[PDB]
Amino acid sequence: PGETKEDIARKEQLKSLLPPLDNIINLYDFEYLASQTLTKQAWAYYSSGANDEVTHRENHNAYHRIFFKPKILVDVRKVDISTDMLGSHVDVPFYVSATALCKLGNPLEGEKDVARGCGQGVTKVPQMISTLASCSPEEIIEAAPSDKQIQWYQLYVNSDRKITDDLVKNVEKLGVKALFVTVDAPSLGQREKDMKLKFSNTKTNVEESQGASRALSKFIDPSLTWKDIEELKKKTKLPIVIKGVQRTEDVIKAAEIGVSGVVLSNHGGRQLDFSRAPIEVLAETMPILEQRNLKDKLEVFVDGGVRRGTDVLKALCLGAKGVGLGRPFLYANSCYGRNGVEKAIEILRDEIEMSMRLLGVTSIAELKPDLLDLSTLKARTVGVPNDVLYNEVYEGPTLTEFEDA
Amino acid sequence: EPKLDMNKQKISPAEVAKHNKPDDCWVVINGYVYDLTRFLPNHPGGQDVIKFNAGKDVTAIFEPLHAPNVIDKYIAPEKKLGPLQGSMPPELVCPPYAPGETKEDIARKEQLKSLLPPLDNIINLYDFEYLASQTLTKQAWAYYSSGANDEVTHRENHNAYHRIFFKPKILVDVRKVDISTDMLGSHVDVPFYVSATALCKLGNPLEGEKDVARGCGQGVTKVPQMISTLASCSPEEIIEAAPSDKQIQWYQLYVNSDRKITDDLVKNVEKLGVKALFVTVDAPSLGQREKDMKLKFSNTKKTNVEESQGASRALSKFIDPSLTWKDIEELKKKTKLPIVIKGVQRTEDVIKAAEIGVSGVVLSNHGGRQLDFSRAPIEVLAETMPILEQRNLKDKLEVFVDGGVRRGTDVLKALCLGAKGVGLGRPFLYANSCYGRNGVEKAIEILRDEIEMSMRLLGVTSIAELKPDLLDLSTLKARTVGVPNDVLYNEVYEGPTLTEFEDA
Amino acid sequence: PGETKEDIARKEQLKSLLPPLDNIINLYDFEYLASQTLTKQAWAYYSSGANDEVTHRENHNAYHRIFFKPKILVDVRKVDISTDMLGSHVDVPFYVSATALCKLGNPLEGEKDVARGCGQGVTKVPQMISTLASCSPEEIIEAAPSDKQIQWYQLYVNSDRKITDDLVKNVEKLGVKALFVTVDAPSLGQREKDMKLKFSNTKTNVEESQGASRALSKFIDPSLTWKDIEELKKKTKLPIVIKGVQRTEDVIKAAEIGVSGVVLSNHGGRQLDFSRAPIEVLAETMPILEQRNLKDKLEVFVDGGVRRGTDVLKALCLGAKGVGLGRPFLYANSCYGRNGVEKAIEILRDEIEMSMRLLGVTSIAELKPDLLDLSTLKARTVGVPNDVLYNEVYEGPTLTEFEDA
Amino acid sequence: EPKLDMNKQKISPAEVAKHNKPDDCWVVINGYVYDLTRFLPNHPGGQDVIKFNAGKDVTAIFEPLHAPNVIDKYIAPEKKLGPLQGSMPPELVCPPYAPGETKEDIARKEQLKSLLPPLDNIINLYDFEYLASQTLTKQAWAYYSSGANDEVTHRENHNAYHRIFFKPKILVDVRKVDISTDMLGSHVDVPFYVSATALCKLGNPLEGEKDVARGCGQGVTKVPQMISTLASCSPEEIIEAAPSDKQIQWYQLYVNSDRKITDDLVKNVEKLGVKALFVTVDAPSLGQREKDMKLKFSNTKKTNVEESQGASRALSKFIDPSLTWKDIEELKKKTKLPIVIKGVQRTEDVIKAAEIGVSGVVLSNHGGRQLDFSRAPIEVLAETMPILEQRNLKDKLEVFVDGGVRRGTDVLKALCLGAKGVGLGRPFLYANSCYGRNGVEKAIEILRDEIEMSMRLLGVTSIAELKPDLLDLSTLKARTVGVPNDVLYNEVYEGPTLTEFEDA
Numbered sequence A, C: 001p002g003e004t005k006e007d008i009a010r011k012e013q014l015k016s017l018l019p020p021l022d023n024i025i026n027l028y029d030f031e032y033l034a035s036q037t038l039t040k041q042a043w044a045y046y047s048s049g050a051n052d053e054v055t056h057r058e059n060h061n062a063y064h065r066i067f068f069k070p071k072i073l074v075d076v077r078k079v080d081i082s083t084d085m086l087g088s089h090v091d092v093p094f095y096v097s098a099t100a101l102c103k104l105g106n107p108l109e110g111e112k113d114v115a116r117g118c119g120q121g122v123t124k125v126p127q128m129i130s131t132l133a134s135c136s137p138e139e140i141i142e143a144a145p146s147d148k149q150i151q152w153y154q155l156y157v158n159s160d161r162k163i164t165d166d167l168v169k170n171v172e173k174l175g176v177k178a179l180f181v182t183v184d185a186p187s188l189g190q191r192e193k194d195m196k197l198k199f200s201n202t203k204t205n206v207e208e209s210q211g212a213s214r215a216l217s218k219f220i221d222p223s224l225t226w227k228d229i230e231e232l233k234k235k236t237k238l239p240i241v242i243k244g245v246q247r248t249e250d251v252i253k254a255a256e257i258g259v260s261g262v263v264l265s266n267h268g269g270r271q272l273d274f275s276r277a278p279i280e281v282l283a284e285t286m287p288i289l290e291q292r293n294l295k296d297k298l299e300v301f302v303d304g305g306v307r308r309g310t311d312v313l314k315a316l317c318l319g320a321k322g323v324g325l326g327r328p329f330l331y332a333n334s335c336y337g338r339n340g341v342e343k344a345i346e347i348l349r350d351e352i353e354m355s356m357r358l359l360g361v362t363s364i365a366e367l368k369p370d371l372l373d374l375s376t377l378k379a380r381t382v383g384v385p386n387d388v389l390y391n392e393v394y395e396g397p398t399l400t401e402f403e404d405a
Numbered sequence B, D: 001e002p003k004l005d006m007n008k009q010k011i012s013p014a015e016v017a018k019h020n021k022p023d024d025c026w027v028v029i030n031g032y033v034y035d036l037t038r039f040l041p042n043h044p045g046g047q048d049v050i051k052f053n054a055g056k057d058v059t060a061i062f063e064p065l066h067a068p069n070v071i072d073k074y075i076a077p078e079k080k081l082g083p084l085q086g087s088m089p090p091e092l093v094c095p096p097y098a099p100g101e102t103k104e105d106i107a108r109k110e111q112l113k114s115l116l117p118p119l120d121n122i123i124n125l126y127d128f129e130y131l132a133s134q135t136l137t138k139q140a141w142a143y144y145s146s147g148a149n150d151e152v153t154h155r156e157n158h159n160a161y162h163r164i165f166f167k168p169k170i171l172v173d174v175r176k177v178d179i180s181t182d183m184l185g186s187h188v189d190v191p192f193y194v195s196a197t198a199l200c201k202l203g204n205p206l207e208g209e210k211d212v213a214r215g216c217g218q219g220v221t222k223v224p225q226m227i228s229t230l231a232s233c234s235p236e237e238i239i240e241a242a243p244s245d246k247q248i249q250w251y252q253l254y255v256n257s258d259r260k261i262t263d264d265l266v267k268n269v270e271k272l273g274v275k276a277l278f279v280t281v282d283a284p285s286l287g288q289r290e291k292d293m294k295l296k297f298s299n300t301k302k303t304n305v306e307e308s309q310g311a312s313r314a315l316s317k318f319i320d321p322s323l324t325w326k327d328i329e330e331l332k333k334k335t336k337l338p339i340v341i342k343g344v345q346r347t348e349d350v351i352k353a354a355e356i357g358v359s360g361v362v363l364s365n366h367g368g369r370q371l372d373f374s375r376a377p378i379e380v381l382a383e384t385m386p387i388l389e390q391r392n393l394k395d396k397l398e399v400f401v402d403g404g405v406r407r408g409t410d411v412l413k414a415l416c417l418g419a420k421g422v423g424l425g426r427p428f429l430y431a432n433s434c435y436g437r438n439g440v441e442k443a444i445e446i447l448r449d450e451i452e453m454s455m456r457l458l459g460v461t462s463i464a465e466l467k468p469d470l471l472d473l474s475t476l477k478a479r480t481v482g483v484p485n486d487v488l489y490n491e492v493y494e495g496p497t498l499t500e501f502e503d504a
């Protein structure tokens, strides 16, 4: 914590003042509400990124370097946003990514409420479950209200492989439909908001408890290699997706060892700062795949900074099989539990359908590159420092004013 | 007053208050009863406002915001039940439409309205915007000023103009300049026009679209007026208010899913004398303007979600989402009026328009109220015109643009690129809202003067002389998104400071 | 005015608190002091630009799109910043440009104090005199303390040519050394700060007193043409410079009709808004001249937004014969009269010498293009609108804080 | 204590107070009298501070800011007059040097100093900066944090790093990583070093440069220390304070106009054991740091200007402005120590350095304290290294960079481009100012950890594996200057807002 007596007071009062879920307009509304009501600990843990949080923000910003070239006078009365992911039919082209410790924001239900929100309405959304979920995989998969809802397991390979061996067999038996092996966290990203929180709140055996090593964990084997993945292919039938690819070279390697897909991701900017926006790695990757007809050998997903239907649409047009979101659902789930998640799903689903009509296409398969203006995709810029004295003494024009009372 | 049959079984203040449910909605408007149940899902203004005022007397909401002809033209006769007997409980008759408007806002605003500066003191189009932002009801200001979703395109429409600079000619005789031109076969005094916008009555209750008509045709400088199919005034009263016979009026058309209504409407406006039809194609689905939505919510713990309708709520029979190129070809065969396709957002579709032979297109994204991340039309114009020429198609299609135009230099830049004319929406709504018809006229003078003055400094003397070589287009594509700012580095950094006066 | 009783009160008190001239560090200091002490009328008149004042600011900003490629290990003990302009030797590579109505900020002396500041110290700076100066040309030229100081006359050709005829003969007889004919003001730029001032302070014969025409004046003939300049060449011996060129095409025409030079200028951004930064037109112009050895046929000057020695140095390296400044001197002259002007001259002179040593060259002639990095000269950018909701709800990292008292 | 001849005609508190003029300046330092008249124009600290305290006892200003050896090494014996007799009027003996420091600032700051957070709670290098900004005297903070003129380059040094992104490798065994490397013939624990900075005593009065020496060599991780010719400590005490024999100390050299002093100094530091000589060439003239100047003015109508000296005031015999390439060639012949040219700002000069055969260069602009608009060294490095290879010259010259480095990822980016090592100045001055030697050590741990942690995520395990293919350099040249913001448009515009809580 580090949560005062009056901190708890103010927050329970704010949660009682949460607006009606019917009044939430977009995914940022959940984020705002969450920012005022979660404990300092849960907020820092969910909202933080690595170091200067540049990548975390760039993930979102890069989407804005892409504009649309919509078609008009196309019959868009009826549209469809369902598609297939990893051999299963899905109602939407997005999914809930794995996020550890959902109980920080939703103590009673944690990941269970996410499972429920994902399957309780007419729209069924796939849920990725973190190896580090605060609920057990059994209880999470059991809370899923529908048999038609997909659940994927995000796997962290343990240094003690036998634990992973047992884990993989357990989740497979439980029904998950795929394994997403996270490879962008061999060392823990440094999330300074958390750390600052812990210091303001106020070690006997050496060896691998000092400096950089403090960011290593036996839980997440830092020596995981391509060979290990090849091995994993032989020990399971579940489709395998490598989560955390950050360069085209590694997408090519994934195809070469024949896994089912990759997730171009930088862990929501929580790992290596200055890793590129996945939307940008995607734009570079897909064309290169086609130039080797790896076209369909590999399904390419992306996550990071997706907050609008139009963000999703851009990824789809570039060729992403699906688009993942982490924080928005966390916030929705933390403020309004399962219903919050359901509402988040509706908001994103309606955003995609609506803008799909304005783009002039009627199905996910019709989302193609020609629908995008990619001409300014590389305009990732850093301005020359502002001329302080010049702009400080300068006085800009002013608007006309009303007469004196 | 609607053409209701006053010879029908009168109805009672009790049998009405009954039907106040989404599937059995009855309402009273000026002593008459209507079954609006089948209607609401298509209400252009949203079903919610009708839903949450069902079974009640709604005249105070309805009357000041609608064209005199909507019940006639859009409600099925069978649905016009009959005369109401008496009144309605005082708590069952709705008050004026002013979502979130407090008694204190009304107070403060009527006072500010008395303090509006003299129209002679208005310098530029932003002044009207400022004044309007402080005096309109929250609802009117939201409805006029909102854009779709994050309002990026709305802003980008304007910003993109700043990616273009001028290459002016000096030592050219510019004593005399002329800014008149021709558009769609008619001579026009200026190269700009007032674009279609619905609900002009929100900011100008007494006159709405009619004062726009007056402002555009009363002075020495006349400007073309485009009339929205969804105007708050009828096309006959708008056209009749036109002070001059030489002023141009265009009709913006929304094709109905019921093509008979559109066929009748086209014949009607053509008989009324509009000079062209601008068919809007960028709104098959309603853009989400969150400022409005928020305002409507502020009124109206852990969960409630049940029968929330989807993306279908943004569809309406008033704007047929199935409109296609074939429909436009058919439209050409039913009218002698020049046809312009309004809402083109890519060169491919400007080519298709040339191919089916319509008169022109408006490169537009509806003022950024529809698809967010649609490009600035000025940028689409830059790409389009050269491509037309690489096929002579230039002069085969008149290309207009709108969106974010606030300065005469913005107009000049579009003209140099080859636009036939430039449209403006919001600025005129603000001018009309604050100062009525004379506001519209003042706006016209401001923009006219801005175009002539800067035309002299550009070194040309007529619209036909505005060409691309007058522009520096080298940085037109420098539409950028910076790397996120380094928060810690910039927070702790202290910049240079100016010298200061000696202590008193 | 529009100057209250308490406005005058506050200002006379502020002027009495002006810091010692020895304490002025750079040209912005004069601007700040001037902004607090001049009358609203004088401040609006001097500080305003046309319309949205984009060009006025861009004039300065474009200099920052150029960096230096300085040479080290060069003997820079002794340096020299003198050069020649229009056939005369000058101590510095800059000059005071014409500015109308100097008496608004300096009521007692106006342009006379500029003449004095320009010639009273060891550094003699050329002064350009506005046809619309608030002092007569005779009194201004007479106030010049030195015979070695240069004075140029900025000419506005009158609709009544005979007046210009007489004017040209008069200034020539008085000793001015050149004629700078202003061609960027056939119509008056709209300076909204002025106008706003006049409206808050609260027409009988038609014809050419309405709308756009109100910006025309018989004083400044709007029908001036190249032919007229050709004529002017035949009626005077003084070198002729066309002031207000804004495109290379017109620099080429100047060479063709054989005038002495041009001033790439947009009137300090007071005329046509969105006219380019002269520094940028210069970078494009000089190479094109050489590709026609017009190399030395025409002397090319520039003004607009020059506030630092390094700004001057950039212009010189690109090939400008001299660099003009308007507002800074106005401010200096308005706050500290002639001494203010002298101090401004020292500040700019020392800035140029000092940075010249760091650039690794020792004379104006050694300032060349290879000293500049022009690779980002065209990075004049306009960002995509800021994502308001995303950045508003986002919370950036924070610095560590001191312990509680 | 200086080596003064205590056998000279004593002098009196009256014959001293006399010489208080710029051309007859006498001062007393620790009971001795000196004729500093010929000296002041060359005083590295500016002539003004000596001028305006002439004829007085200045020990309180002098003593805490200078190396123990400056009167010995830089004042002519003849100018060391003799012993003073008695004292000096209490109003003729200067107080500590604290320009603009009010009694209340001293109060507030000594209190904040007691409230400094535990060193274990410092997370990154910006924390030291923040803490230092609140606790140093105005003079010390200005002197450390200022840049030249508009401080653009100072900021650009840092900003340019953000124009580079990473292309990390995944699924690589990164259990073990090593960040040691070699620099100028010596093995180093890390790929970074503490760069030369004068006046470390400003922020650390008791230890200055000696605590830097300690911080750099006391822990398990040792870092190279570059010593300024203008350090506030003597080279012998700085080198003697070094806790470890394995720690590296480099000497930053400023060639004197009097080459005999330089010849002696080079021989002295070489005998003391420094491992290299970094000759600084980017300061022939003193950069103008306006924050300092302003501070000095705040103390000290229409005019006074008379004998104001010019650009010459920025020259000093301590830094020979006539240093040339030939001088460096000669220097090679007088020492066995590796020579590095510090302050190279363009590729042409890196080539010239290879040609004369020195050991390396530091691409640097002196932390943005010299020429404003000098480019970010990280950008010069990107251009330089490939060009070296297109001539094999790589490996012939070790290329270091400094300026604006605050994160391990900044270091990693320079290493991938081919830098042999990366220097930091300010961060260490702030760490040393707030927490002394342990602060320096903590800074070293912070940066070390940052390099190792991100190295693992980059997918490599040693310094030698840091290569260009690990970097995305596609936007390295996107150094931009936006069009001026449209003030009126953006002022009147109202952005989207977040939903809000229900009223209490």
Ligand code: HEM
Binding pocket: B027, B036, B043, B044, B045, B046, B049, B050, B053, B058, B061, B062, B065, B066, B070, B071, B074, B075, B097, B139, B143, B198, B199, B230, B231, B292
């Ligand atoms: C008789 C049938 C009706 C027709 C044809 C009609 C048509 C329209 C149209 C064209 C608009 C403008 C849409 C736009 O902004 O583009 C509008 C707005 C509106 N209408 Fe109606 N309307 C009808 C009945 C009603 C009724 C019965 C109510 C009862 C409360 C109502 C309340 C409103 C309101 C409040 C708005 C403003 C909505 C907003 O933008 O916040 N209308 N209507």
Ligand code: HEM
Binding pocket: D027, D036, D043, D044, D045, D046, D049, D050, D053, D058, D061, D062, D065, D066, D070, D071, D074, D075, D097, D139, D143, D198, D199, D230, D231, D292
């Ligand atoms: C005995 C001869 C002296 C030598 C060799 C000497 C040398 C230096 C050096 C190398 C610096 C650091 C310059 C830098 O920042 O790079 C300095 C700063 C300074 N010196 Fe001296 N100094 C001498 C005498 C004096 C005297 C007599 C005073 C008397 C008041 C004085 C006052 C200062 C002050 C105040 C500073 C700090 C200036 C600032 O940055 O604001 N020095 N000196």
Ligand SMILES: Cc1cc2nc3c(=O)[nH]c(=O)nc-3n(C[C@H](O)[C@H](O)[C@H](O)COP(=O)(O)O)c2cc1C
Binding pocket: A045, A046, A047, A059, A097, A098, A099, A100, A130, A131, A132, A133, A154, A182, A243, A265, A266, A267, A268, A269, A270, A303, A304, A305, A306, A324, A325, A326, A327, A328, A330
């Ligand atoms: C609080 C939090 C916890 C996370 N935990 C995991 C995890 O345990 N395993 C994993 O593979 N990714 C994890 N992620 C990363 C997400 O799966 C995903 O890559 C990221 O959230 C996408 O970016 P976004 O938050 O902007 O949508 C986490 C992200 C957050 C914000």
Ligand SMILES: Cc1cc2nc3c(=O)[nH]c(=O)nc-3n(C[C@H](O)[C@H](O)[C@H](O)COP(=O)(O)O)c2cc1C
Binding pocket: B143, B144, B145, B157, B195, B196, B197, B198, B228, B229, B230, B231, B252, B280, B342, B364, B365, B366, B367, B368, B369, B402, B403, B404, B405, B423, B424, B425, B426, B427, B429
């Ligand atoms: C409040 C408002 C209502 C509008 N209503 C309509 C309409 O009914 N039909 C139509 O074709 N366009 C409509 N438009 C779009 C305009 O015709 C035009 O595309 C746009 O306003 C140009 O952008 P601007 O407001 O930045 O000048 C509307 C725009 C606004 C701002």
Ligand SMILES: Cc1cc2nc3c(=O)[nH]c(=O)nc-3n(C[C@H](O)[C@H](O)[C@H](O)COP(=O)(O)O)c2cc1C
Binding pocket: C045, C046, C047, C059, C097, C098, C099, C100, C130, C131, C132, C133, C154, C182, C243, C265, C266, C267, C268, C269, C270, C303, C304, C305, C306, C324, C325, C326, C327, C328, C330
């Ligand atoms: C208050 C003011 C008055 C001016 N008057 C004239 C004038 O009468 N004639 C002329 O040719 N230029 C005139 N100029 C423009 C200057 O000669 C010069 O082009 C401009 O000041 C350069 O830009 P700067 O102010 O940023 O240095 C004036 C500028 C200002 C600011």
Ligand SMILES: Cc1cc2nc3c(=O)[nH]c(=O)nc-3n(C[C@H](O)[C@H](O)[C@H](O)COP(=O)(O)O)c2cc1C
Binding pocket: D143, D144, D145, D157, D195, D196, D197, D198, D228, D229, D230, D231, D252, D280, D342, D364, D365, D366, D367, D368, D369, D402, D403, D404, D405, D423, D424, D425, D426, D427, D429
């Ligand atoms: C307060 C201060 C004093 C400095 N003194 C010297 C010096 O005496 N000699 C030298 O070669 N460089 C000197 N430098 C420059 C540094 O060696 C180095 O180039 C610079 O600090 C790197 O930039 P950074 O501060 O952003 O890390 C100084 C820098 C600062 C900030």
